[PDB]
């Protein structure tokens, strides 16, 4: 998932790598 809560200046090494 890109946004976990409201995470706009962080997406993971998992959503779009």
UniProtKB/Swiss-Prot annotation:
Compartment(s) of residence: Fimbrium; Membrane
Annotated S-S bridges: 2-15
Highest taxon, organism lineage: Bacteria
Family of the protein in this entry: Belongs to the N-Me-Phe pilin family.
Quaternary structure and interacting proteins, as annotated: The pili are polar flexible filaments of about 5.4 nanometers diameter and 2.5 micrometers average length; they consist of only a single polypeptide chain arranged in a helical configuration of five subunits per turn in the assembled pilus.
Protein name, UniProt field: Fimbrial protein
Species per Swiss-Prot/TrEMBL record: Pseudomonas aeruginosa
